[PDB]
Amino acid sequence: HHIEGRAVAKDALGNDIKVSEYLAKHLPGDRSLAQGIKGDPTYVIVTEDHQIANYGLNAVCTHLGCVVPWNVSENKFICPCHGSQYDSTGKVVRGPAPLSLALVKATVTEDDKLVFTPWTEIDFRTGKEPWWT
Numbered sequence: 001h002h003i004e005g006r007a008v009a010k011d012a013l014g015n016d017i018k019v020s021e022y023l024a025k026h027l028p029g030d031r032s033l034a035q036g037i038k039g040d041p042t043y044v045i046v047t048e049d050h051q052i053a054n055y056g057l058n059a060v061c062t063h064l065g066c067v068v069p070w071n072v073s074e075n076k077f078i079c080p081c082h083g084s085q086y087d088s089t090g091k092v093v094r095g096p097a098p099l100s101l102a103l104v105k106a107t108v109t110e111d112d113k114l115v116f117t118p119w120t121e122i123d124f125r126t127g128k129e130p131w132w133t
């Protein structure tokens, strides 16, 4: 969680993401996958300010495991496997997925890297305690 369940965000080729370079390639609103904790596909989110959001999103659909794509037009994550839908922040807004996409703490380091750590606080979307904890 602190150091044990922590992961350096990596790109498709397994190379550590360089944040400055990453932001130079992803504009505000961008949501793209990176390799996260245990290598899980995790959305890196670029804010309106053009910064890495304080949280990432584990893209594994809570229904049956498909990696949920981001639909710019619908402004929602929509799973093509069985139609589950989640809002801009990953809150499940349409089943069959029972739970929201897992939040992941996303932190920019001093050595220009992105670190993912388990999100243990309150789920600011449901108020509920993380189902992923």
Ligand code: FES
Pocket: 061, 062, 063, 064, 065, 066, 079, 080, 081, 082, 083, 084, 095, 096, 097
């Ligand atoms: S795996 Fe996403 S709706 Fe079934």
